[PDB]
């Protein structure tokens, strides 16, 4: 068969490339179902690991958890101000994942050890059979859309999501009125990716989040039905080779960009990633420092707005390049941060002095007292306090870990996409194994030097 | 068709310099980058780098040196804001706030992405294997980590690499003070990669040079023994192999040359990938190893180690950078 | 700027005394 190097062309270290060939489709399916099982295996076991070492005293983000916050964001297990009501829902999801891993592992072992080596009936696909591969694409788009709509329905009907912007603190609440405006939802796509706008990372309420999910669920149902019913058109014939490595390369490039986007979401956004669960963003932690050094100087009689720094700028409060009242110091770079413990200090011009001096509603100090001294700063062996500081504190933020890991994943997958894009083009062309000695293309080209005729 | 004539001319392998569709994007991006950089390196006025109305004089006509000139990074007052030529009031606050740095950077980063794509383009038009762009992706990852990814992670384009020699040195020192990159394992890999790539470059060059086939006389260059396009191998792989094997042991010297040049590609490329990634995770403040106060005596007194001495020097750098700009004791990102 | 005066004349003979040498050597090779 095609399981060694000699009858496949692929060495041991490039051996899953032996599943490229379209007669080995049962093994392609087996490798995939077993990999999906491994993904669910980690999803179960790592969550159970987080639960088994969870101390209820420390909130959630000091524990070094990354799957606990994802569940808590969905309004499961937690209630008011993100307090863990019960440790049983996290355990239930951690075991439901294990059972799914078991079932998917059995399927992956079946189609790789015992099931039919070549698929048939309505499951036989060839990579060059473009109507069939688009039809499989369409089923995947339709199933993805019905998951996105089901998530939106759950956010709207059953239970709810954690709203960090809910009145006071932020409780779980079900989104009754999602933003169905095409002007608003697709206006996120035209916002500049730069500071101030933050292209889609600045989605900052649950109506916009769930309305965009309703839209994309419908859009994906539509595109899935389109690909089941309409084969690839004539204009998409010579755009790129229709091989399997091409399809992989395109997936790789899109998901590399998607990992970069998720790194931005975990690092800047505090709506879909509530800081009760993931800890404060660096912008929000750095405004929390200024807010607590502000409230120190209230009470000991230091009028803030007439206070100069080393440079004549505002010692605690100054004006933006736009001219809005922002926190002074180096934290003037994060004047675009919008944390919900600070929005009731926001007026018309930014931080007005009216509901700043005889404001802060007690918890708003406490919360910002918490986020001041839990900043995303740390090391590989888990320590905090700048970097040139004494090691006593054993802590590195979840947001640091997730953003670092997904920039890493985005970078390797952009590299892997470039690898498979070049290789797919070269393999379809017929020169991915080297130059033909019999005829070399540069030998049949005219010279580039202008003097040479 | 005029358009088909255009697509033939762009994708033409007849041009002295290949253009291609990545090059039709690359050439204007370089035009802007080169124009604004040569303009700003010579004649830009001082830039308010840290947003505190302390202009830093970075250009060669403002009493400044080739070593010490720099296109100074964009003001900390701007942060990560899009600050083009037209969103500023005038052409003098834009110069004052460091707009030239952002313009050069925002054309330089896509120009390098397009140069990588152009390398793939020409590999495809010449029928050669398509992965020189993969090797080029390592310095590109490195230069995007210090021009885009670290400013994004830290929150301002003032934390970007200054476009100058001494500005680069300043970036290195401030980065060590704030992140301890020397104790970052990705940077130890990057150092192993650059020093070992230099080792392996010198080693491979000396071996191929040392086992050259005699074709020339002693009063003419050995490079005349090779003719461009000759099919015969110009050196002796067997002799260089036997020498290297006698030098260390038997199963050490590459017999194969395709494997040998894959290793020559793979070692510095992979290690520069890792060190670009290290800059990028320190962009999210995931700093290097920390061994301060790690060796304790019987009572509990800290016995200093060499990492403590490195900390003490990093603290030296730490409490002197951006002096008139930290109003609180905690310099966050 | 309190720069070395002869630093100009050091800069230009450092970089054109070798340069003319190379051009001499090139031109006599080309002819």
């Amino acid at each position: 068969p095609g399981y060694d190097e000699a009858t496949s062309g692929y060495a041991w270290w490039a051996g899953n490339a032996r599943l490229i060939t379209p007669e080995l489709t049962g093994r392609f399916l087996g490798a995939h179902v077993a990999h999906a099982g491994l993904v669910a295996l980690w999803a179960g076991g790592m969550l159970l690991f987080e639960v088994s070492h969870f101390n209820l005293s420390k909130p959630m983000y000091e524990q070094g958890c990354i799957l606990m916050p994802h569940i808590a964001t969905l309004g499961i297990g937690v209630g008011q101000s993100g307090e863990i009501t019960s440790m049983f829902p996290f355990f239930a999801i951690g075991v439901a994942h294990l059972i799914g891993s078991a079932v998917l592992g059995i399927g992956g072992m079946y189609h790789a050890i015992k099931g039919p080596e070549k698929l048939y009936g309505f499951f036989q696909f060839d990579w060059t059979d473009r109507a069939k591969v688009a039809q499989i694409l369409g089923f995947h788009i339709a199933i993805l859309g019905i998951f996105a709509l089901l998530f939106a329905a759950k956010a709207m009907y059953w239970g709810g999501l954690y709203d960090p912007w809910a009145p006071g603190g932020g409780d779980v609440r079900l989104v009754t009125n999602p933003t169905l405006d095409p002007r608003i939802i697709f206006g996120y796509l035209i916002k500049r990716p730069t500071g101030g706008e933050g292209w889609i990372v600045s989605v900052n309420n649950l109506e916009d989040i769930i309305g965009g999910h309703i839209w994309i669920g419908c859009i994906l149902i539509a595109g899935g039905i389109w690909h089941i019913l309409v084969p690839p058109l004539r204009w998409t014939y010579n755009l790129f080779p229709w091989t399997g490595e091409t399809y992989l390369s395109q997936s790789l490039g899109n998901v590399a960009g998607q990992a970069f986007i998720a790194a931005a979401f975990i690092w800047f956004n505090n709506t879909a990633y509530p800081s009760v669960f993931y800890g404060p963003t660096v912008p929000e932690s750095s405004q929390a420092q200024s807010f607590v050094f502000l409230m120190r100087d209230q009470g000991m009689g230091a009028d803030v707005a007439s206070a100069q720094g080393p440079t004549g700028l505002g010692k605690y409060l100054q004006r933006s390049p736009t001219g809005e009242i922002i926190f002074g110091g180096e934290t003037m770079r994060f004047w675009d941060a919008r944390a919900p413990w600070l929005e009731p200090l926001r007026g018309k011009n930014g931080l007005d002095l009216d509901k700043l001096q005889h404001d802060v509603q007690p918890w708003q100090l406490r919360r910002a007292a918490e986020y001041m001294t839990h900043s995303p700063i740390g090391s590989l062996n888990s320590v905090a306090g700048l970097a040139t500081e004494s090691n006593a504190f054993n802590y590195v933020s979840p947001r640091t870990w997730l953003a670092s890991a997904h920039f890493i994943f985005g970078f390797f997958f952009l590299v892997g996409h470039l690898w498979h894009a070049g290789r797919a083009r070269a393999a379809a062309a017929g020169f991915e194994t080297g130059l033909d000695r019999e005829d070399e293309p540069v030998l049949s080209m005219a010279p580039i030097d202008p003097s040479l005729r | 068709s005029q358009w088909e004539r255009f697509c033939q001319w762009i994708t033409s392998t007849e041009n002295r310099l290949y253009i291609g569709w990545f090059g039709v994007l690359m050439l204007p991006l370089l035009g802007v980058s080169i124009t604004v950089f040569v303009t700003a390196f010579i004649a830009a006025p001082p830039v308010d780098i840290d947003g505190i109305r302390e202009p830093l004089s970075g250009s060669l006509l403002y009493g400044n040196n080739i070593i010490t000139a720099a296109v100074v990074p964009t003001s900390n007052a701007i942060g990560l804001h899009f600050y083009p030529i037209w969103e500023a009031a005038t052409l003098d606050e834009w110069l004052y706030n460091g707009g030239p740095y952002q313009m050069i950077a925002f054309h330089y980063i896509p120009a390098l992405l397009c140069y990588l794509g152009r390398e793939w383009e020409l590999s495809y038009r010449l029928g050669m294997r398509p992965w020189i762009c993969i090797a080029y992706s390592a310095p590109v990852a490195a230069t995007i980590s210090v021009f885009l990814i670290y400013p994004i992670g830290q929150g301002s384009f003032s934390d970007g690499l200054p476009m100058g020699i001494s500005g680069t040195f300043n970036f290195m020192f401030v980065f060590q003070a704030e992140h301890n990159i020397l104790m970052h394992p990705f940077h130890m890999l990057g150092v192993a990669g650059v020093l070992g790539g230099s080792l392996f470059c010198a080693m491979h060059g000396s071996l191929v040079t040392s086992s050259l086939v005699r074709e020339t006389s002693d009063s003419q260059s050995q490079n005349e023994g090779y003719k461009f396009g000759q099919e015969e191998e110009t050196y002796n792989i067997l002799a260089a192999h036997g020498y290297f094997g006698r030098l260390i042991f038997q199963y050490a010297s590459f017999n194969n040359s395709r494997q040998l040049h894959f290793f020559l590609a793979a070692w510095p490329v992979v290690c520069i990938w890792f060190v670009a990634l290290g800059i990028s995770t320190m962009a999210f403040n995931l700093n290097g190893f920390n061994f301060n106060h790690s060796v304790l005596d019987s009572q509990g007194r800290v016995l200093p180690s060499w990492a403590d001495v490195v900390n003490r020097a990093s603290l030296g750098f730490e409490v002197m950078h951006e002096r008139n700009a930290h109003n609180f004791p905690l310099d966050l990102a | 700027m309190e720069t070395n005066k002869l630093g100009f004349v050091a800069s230009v003979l450092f970089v054109f005394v070798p340069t003319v040498f190379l051009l001499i050597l090139y031109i006599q090779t080309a002819s």
Binding site: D449 | L61, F228, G229 | M1, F8, S11, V15
Partner: peptide, 30 residues
């Protein structure tokens, strides 16, 4: 006059770069 030296030398690098691309010695196949 210190900037003049720097700009003149940079112009010399740019001229060498142009002439080594544009008017380069042709590589003939054997």
């Amino acid at each position: 006059m210190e900037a003049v030296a720097y700009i003149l030398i940079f112009a010399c690098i740019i001229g060498t770069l142009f002439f080594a691309i544009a008017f380069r010695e042709p590589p003939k196949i054997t």
